[model samples]
Structures are given as C-alpha cells and as structure tokens.
Target chain A: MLIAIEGVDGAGKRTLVEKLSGAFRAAGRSVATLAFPRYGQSVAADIAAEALHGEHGDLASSVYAMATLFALDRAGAVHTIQGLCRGYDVVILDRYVASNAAYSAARLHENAAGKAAAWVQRIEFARLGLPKPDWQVLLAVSAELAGERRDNYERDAELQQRTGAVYAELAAQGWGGRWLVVGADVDPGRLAATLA
Target chain B: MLIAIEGVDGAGKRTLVEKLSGAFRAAGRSVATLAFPRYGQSVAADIAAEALHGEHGDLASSVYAMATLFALDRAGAVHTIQGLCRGYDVVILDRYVASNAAYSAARLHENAAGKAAAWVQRIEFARLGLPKPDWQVLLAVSAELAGERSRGRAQRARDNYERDAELQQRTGAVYAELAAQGWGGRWLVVGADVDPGRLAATLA
Candidate 1:
C-alpha cells in the first residue's frame, strides 16, 4: 500500500509519520518512507525552495511555475518510488500529488475544482506519469494553528487558511485516490493500527 | 524587432551580440540585449547550472528536466522581454528557445523533427506565450573549432554539456537542421570566420 500524508505547514506531518512508522513496525509490516520536495535530492525542489525564500526574483510569484517545479521533483523520484513499493509491504510519503493540487488551487484563490488543481493533476499523473497514491491522508489543521510555523511560503496565514479549505474539499471529493481526513491532534499509533 | 541569437557552447554568441549591438547602434537602431539562462536572475537557470555541476542527484542525466528548467528561466522573463521589445528598436537575445530545442533533441539523439524539439516549441510558443523572434541567427561553428575555442577558460568551470564533444557535434547538426527549416523565424547561419561588422550590417 502506498499512502501519502499531506497538510499545510506546521500540521505535525513529520511527527505523525514518525509515530506511524513505529506503529507499523510494531505491527510487523515492512515499511518504507519518502518525502516530496526532497530538498537536497531534487533539483526542482531545491530551486522551488530558493524561489520561495526570495532568492529568485518573481519566481515564487508565479504559482504555475512553482507547482511545475514541485511536479518535476516527484517526476525525478518515480524510480525510487517504484523500488520502495516493490521492497516494502507498506510505503508512506510525507506528501504527494494531492498537496500540489490543493496548494496550487488555494494560492490561485480557487477551490479543488479549479483549473490550477486540474492542471497539477494532469501534469503530475497524466503528463509526468507519477504513481498515484493508494490512499491520501489530509491533516486537517486550522490555519490559525498552522501559522505558528514560518518560511517564505509557510508564513502566510491567509494562504494556509485557504489551503486548509482546499484540502477539506479534496478530502470531501476524494481527489486522486481514497482519502482519510484526520485532525491535527489525532493519535498516530491508533490511526496506524487502524490502517494496518 | 526581437532577434534571438543561438548556438552551442563556445560559439561566440556573446561577442557577436556585442558587435551586433554596436552595429545596430551605428545604424541608428536602438538596441537592448538580454541573455537566456540568466545566471543570477533566474531560479531555474541557477538550478540548471547546479545540476550541470553535478549537485542534484541524477539531474544532469535527465535532458527533459534540464530543458524544462531552461524553459522556466525564459518563462520567468516574459514581462521583461515584452518591456524590452516596447522600449527598443532592436532587442537581441544571447540564447533562446532554439538552443533548448537543438540541445534537447541532440541529447536524445534525434533530429530537429524529434519529439523533444517539437515539445519545446509547443511549450514555449503555444503554452507559455513567449514572444516569437522576428529573426534567429545561428553561429555555425564546427564542433572541433568550438572545442579548441572552449579550452582553458579560467573565468569559470565548464559544464558537463560543454565538456561533451559528441554532444556538441550532434547539437550543431540539429541546429543546422532547424536553421534550414527556419524553425523559429527567418534564419541566418554564419561561419565563425565571418566578420561581426559585416554580419551586423546585414542584420541592421
């Protein structure tokens, strides 16, 4: 099973992944983990980071360009993802294609049904040929809660709020695979066991 | 007029640009210059540079990804290009879409009619809406002469593409094919021995 855990910044995705990995191990399921925007590992991801941090003029301002960069990062990881899926009983991603769709739609001030979301889906799944996640997990944290974290992109409270809304819509629509929406405070061990 | 000057590595594009600017100025044509893969100004360009230097894992190996990075750099400059065209009688690009098309096609060992070349044209012209060049000039230098000219430039390190002789040869062939087809616009193919002033006079 390939599962992708997605949310806005500061939604405790890392913590959940950590605890969930342990829980899966305890339950005797062979598991492997990967993360999107693989900073040092992906050129597109590194460029997107630099753009968001204001290293490149006007790059972060173009939402489609940034989304394309994120898609390229995942495209670069296709082989690694396939190998992981083959090796492990369960493969989990820190984030995946859904995150791209939601954030892009939100940044453009559109809902999950908007063009940016559709564009991201087409590019990643149809054009780029990235593997679709078997299950998508949305960490449904409030924007007020997520704003405590900061980065060039993460510091925008309004965007986070909008992004949270888009994620909700994606979960409701089950955009791109089976979706399970969990609150930020959900118990990882219990959720992991339930998933197992 | 928007003119895109294109060629492979060490093909004298910068020198030709400088001379062309002077020649255009001499003829009372207001000229403005820009370069693609704008090193410090574009995130995509900077990232492509890093990939060429072998920074990111397996990035330099993927021609399509590298080509996309180059395309993004130009995409980021659409407004600038528009402004330059509005402000100047002649706007010249040091390198442009043809370089991307030629190199990508060559890397895939395909000709100008290949998928990679066609993809570049569709994305840049149709999808991205970049301004098409009124003219495209190909500095037709042999791969052997280009290699000799490229040697021992102490100002910076040579990229993986620059170091590949066969790739340069293939790229030159693809570029010739593009020029013959008038791929971007009206085409001009000039040898290295051609005088910049004469070339500039012809363009002016």
Candidate 2:
C-alpha cells in the first residue's frame, strides 16, 4: 500500500510518519519512507530549498517553479517507489504532491490570486504526471496550537496560514484519498494505530 | 538604453561593464550598473551561489532555475530600469539573460547534451519577455587564458569542471541575436569610435 502523510509545516507530518512506520514494522509489514525534494539528493529539492529560503524572486513565481520541482522530484522517483512497494508491504511518504500543491498554490494565490495558483497547479500536474495518493493522512491542528509548536510557523506566519488554508481546501474538494485529520488533541500512538 | 555584457565565468563581463559605465560617464552620460541575482539582496542569487558551489544536483536544472530567478530579479526592477533609463544615457547590465543561457546551457550541453538547453531558453524568454541587449558583447578568450585569469576556474579544475562548453556555445548563440557573425571576435566595444580589431585585441 502507498501511504502518503501530508500537512502544513509544523503539523507533525514527520513525527506521524515515524510512528506509522514503526507500527507497520511491528505489524510484520515491511515499510519504506520517502520525502519529496529530498534535499542534498535531489536537484528539485535544492531548487525548492532555494525558493523557500527566498533565493528566488517574488513569492509567487518562486513557489510555482519550486513546487513543480517538488512534483517532478517525486515523479522521478516513481519507479523506486513502485519497486519499494513490491519489496515492502507498505511505503510511507512523509510528504508528497499534496504539500507541493498546497504550499505552492498558497504562495501563488497571495500574489496573482486564484488564477495564477490554478495555472501553476495545472502546469505542475502536467509536467510531473503526479498521481493522487491512495491514502492521504492529514495532520490537522488549530491555528493557535500550530503557531506554538514550531519556529517556521512563527517566522513565516503568513505563509503558514495560507498553506494551512490551502490544505483545508484540498481536503474539502475530496481529491481522492483517505483524509485523516489528527489534531493536537489526538495521541501520536493512536494516530499510528488508526493508520494500521 | 539598456546594454548587456555577457560571457562565461571568466569572460570579464564585470570588468567590461565597469569600463563601459565609465565611458558613458566620460561622454556626459549618466550610468548605473547591475549584476544578476544580486547576491545578498536576492534569494535566487543565494540558490545560484549554492548550485555553483556544487551543493545542488544536475547543473542544468539548478542553473536553469537560478537563471529564471535572475531574469525575474531583473523584471522586478522594471520600474527601476525604466527610471534609470530616463535619467541615465545607459543602464549597463554586467550579466543578464545571456549569462543564464550561456552558463547553464553550456553546463547542460556538456553534461546532458543539447536536449533541454533549447527548451530552457524558450521557457525563460517566454516567461520574462526579456529584451536583448542594445549591444551584446562577447569576450572571447582561449580556455587557457580564462583558466589562468579566473580563480574560480582554477579551483574548478582542481575540484571538477563544474561548468561545461555547452554553456559557452548556447550563450554564443543567444548573443548572436539573429545577426550572422556581424563584428564577431573577442569582445567588441559597442558604441565606440575605436576600430573593432584593436578593441578586440585590447579586450583580450
């Protein structure tokens, strides 16, 4: 099974993935975890990093191009992902296309608004042929709590808020996947159990 | 007038721009000089710096993306460029679209061949609607001399030739500006009374 866990920054996607990976192993299922734009290893990742840190110009275009890179990076790994699925019963992705769509579209929306965001998404999807995840686990958190949990949330408050809104919108649109909303109130172990 | 001077890493684009800016001043023309992705002020520049330093993968993609940022950085200054043009007789760009096209395409050509270089150029041009230089100058130097003059080149050799000949070729093509070998030589000084041969040799 291909399991993709996604959410805004500081939403605990990483921690949740770790917990779920362990759960799968305990359940006697082999698992492999991958993240999009795996920095240092991926050209796309480097580009994304550059954009995220403001190496590119104007938040909208930078986010648009970098998000495409994120999607393409995942597409490039399709074969590896498929091969891992064959070897392992469960393949867990810490982050994937959804993050790209959400974060990038959010940034694009801020500058050019809805039209540019939609255009960016269409182009990115076309470029990467990225498919929706079979199961998408979204770690939901209240804005107040999300702010307290990580520095990125505080540092780029606007971007974080916009990203969260985009994620919520994607979930509402029903993009074909299992949506699990785990808030701060939920125990990490329980979230892992729900995945299993 | 917006004049662009472009070439490979060791092509002395910065020096030429500085010289040209001074010349414009001597001619009672006000001038402003800008270099791309303007490090410190630009995020794109930061990324390019990292990629150039070999912290990124696939020289072609990284540099292509960086070049896009470079152009965007310029576009952001449309008001400024326009403003400068109104006041100054010339606004000289040390490196512009040509740098990205040449440097990145060259690297791509050397590493992956010409497959994506053309696409990269088309995308950048379409995206930026970038203007070709009023006068595009190419500083042609033998690889040996370039190696000696550029500290980065020497270091690159010691480490690895991070940039490739494809970059030079693509840049050369773009500088062609649809002109067939008109005044093609080692760095012709534009808008100057000096003979082309003497200027090229002096630049060399």
Candidate 3:
C-alpha cells in the first residue's frame, strides 16, 4: 500500500512518516520511503526550493508555475515511485500529492472545488498518469499548535499559515480519495498501530 | 523618451528595439534599455518559462496564471525600471508593459481589445504600479506571415502531440515557450521552415 502524508509545511508530516515506516518495519511489512521535490535529488525540486524561499525572488511565487516545478520533479521520478510500490509492502511518503494540490490552490486564491485544485488534479494525476497513494494522511493542526510542534527547517510560517485554510478544505473534499485527518497532537504510535 | 516595442510572436519587436536604441545612441542621448521578465534576476520569468514548457505539467498552463507570472516579474522590478527611466535621456525596451499586455493576451484567445489586454493593463501597470512606456510602438503582423516564420519542434506527448500531429496543431506549448524566450535581441528568422529572410523586408 502506498500512503502519502500531507499537511501545511509545519504540520509534522516527516515525524509521522518516520514513525509509520518504523511501525511497518516492526510489523514485518517491507517499507520504502519517498518525499516530494526531494531537495537534492532532482533539479526541478532544487529550482522549486529556490523559487519558494525567495532565493529566486518572485519567480517561483506564481501558484501555477510553482506547482509545475513540483510536478516536474515527480514526472522524472514516476518510475521510482512505481518500482518502490512493487518492491515494498508499504510505501510511505513524508509529503506527497495532496500538499502540492492544496498549497498551490491556496496561493491561487482557490478552494478545493476551485479551478486550481481541478487544474492540479488534471495536470498531476491525469496528464502525468502517475500512481496515486492508497491513503492520504492529513496532519491537521491550528497555526499556533503546528508552530510549536514543527521543526525549524526553512521556516516560512506566513506562507504555511496562508495555505493552511486550503489544506483543511482539501481534507474535507472527499475527492474520491480515502483520507485520514489526524490532529497534530495525535501520537504517531497510536495511529500507526490503528492504521496498519 | 521611453519607447516600448510590442507585438505578437515573430512580429519583429526586438528588431525595432535595437534600431531605436541605436538611433538614440546616434542622437547623443544617454540611453538605457530594459526588458520585461527580468528572467535571471527574478524567479517570475523562469517560472513563466517553465510553465510554457509544460515542465510544471498543465498546472501553469492556465493563461491567467501565466499572465500573472509575467506581470509579477515586472511588479518586482519596478524600481530598477523606474531608475533607468530617471537616469537615461531615452529608455528603450525590447518588450515592456505591452508584452504583458499582448503575448499572454494572444495566448488566452483574445485580441488586444479583448478583456485579457485590458485586465493585464489594469493589474500590471495600474494596480502593480509598474512604469509605463512614454511612446508605444506596436509591431503589427498578420498571423499568417508570422505563422510562416515559425517551425514545429520535435515530438512530444500531449492532447496536442500525443494524440497525433493533426491534433498537435491545436496547441504545442514548446513553440510558445521558444517564442517567449525572445526576450531582447535581434530576431532574424532562423529555421528552414521559412524561405523568407528577404521576406522580412516585406514586413508590413
């Protein structure tokens, strides 16, 4: 089973993924891990990071174009995603499809039903023909709560809080995907046992 | 005197910007030239470029987002542009306010008089407060002649190319991406797709 962990930037997605992967390993289910725009592995991801952090200035701020850079990195790694799914019983991702969809939609002034979400769905899933995760795990948290729980890696609190509204709506949007919305304070140990 | 050269793709606006800059140099006017996008200095141009290339998938394909990206670059570079105009006797542009007005306007299935043009003008120049050109030189070209000057790139996979070559005629963003990269320079036609180097002389 392929699972995508998604949320606002500071929502503890990485911690949750690591815990889940450890539980899967302990359960004797083979596990593999992946993360989006993998920072160093893909050129597209690096460009995206630069664009978002103002290293590239307003160049990467366009909601549409920024989403494209995220999508481009995945395009080159589709085979890896596919191969991992075949090799492992459980594939865990720190942040995946839903974040790309929600964040860009938020930036574009769009809600879940808005064109930005629809456009991302078309572009990422339909156009690219990439495999979807079996489960989408959303780490729902309030701005204050998430700020305290999150690590200080590339802190763009303003951007994260801005997109938080849309991220919540995407979790609500049944969108035909099975999504598990967990509170920020929920223990990874508790959920990992339940989910597996 | 700040002059902006504006036109559709292959309409030879860059040719005119160069000639105008040269004329200013001859007239002993302190001159500086600027261009839209400010690509290397800003992320907006490169993002816009990636969008047109379909690198970001169809996510940036929406003309509204693409147009916003184009406008955002100028919005961020307003100071440098304003500074150039203040310092130079004549500030020339290969493409400026008019480009944000025209190119994406054309891509969005609209004419210069259409809503896209007027909308971009309002947001980019009026709302974003970017400097406007003092004199606007519009390079008028028919789609037919301009069409003759361009050529299709290799194969790609899309509703345009993946379906078939005939379907490819509807939309191939690679062509649009190449055209937008003509930021500021002489635009001599290069592909064997056109037998009209001399025909550029016929640019009416």
Per lDDT, the best of the predicted structures is 1
TM-score of each: 0.57, 0.49, 0.53
lDDT of candidate 2 over A1-196, digit per residue (tens): 8788878767887777777787778777788888866777654455456656654333224444465456556766877887887798888888876676677656555422354445444544453455546677778765676787722223677777778887776676654456776664566556566776
What lDDT score is found at residue A146 in candidate 3?
68
Model 3, residue A186: C-alpha shift (Å): 3.6
lDDT of 2 by residue, B1-204 (tens): 677675555666666676666666666667787777677754445545655565433332454465555655665556666777777777777766555545555545432234334544454455445554566566555454454556564755422233444444454554444223432122343432334344333333
Off by over 4 Å in 1: A1-68, A71-196, B154-156
- Candidates by DockQ, descending order: 3, 2, 1
> Cα miss at B98, model 3 (Å)?
21
User: For candidate 1, what's the TM-score of chain A, rounded to 2 decimals?
Assistant: 0.94
Which clashing pairs does model 3 show? A59-B43, A59-B44, A68-B56, B158-B162
List DockQ for all candidates: 0.04, 0.05, 0.08
Would you list the C-alpha lDDT of every candidate in the order shown? 0.83, 0.59, 0.63
Output the better candidate (1/3) by DockQ. 3
So what's the TM-score on candidate 2?
Answer: 0.49
Q: Chain B TM per candidate, please?
A: 0.95, 0.68, 0.68
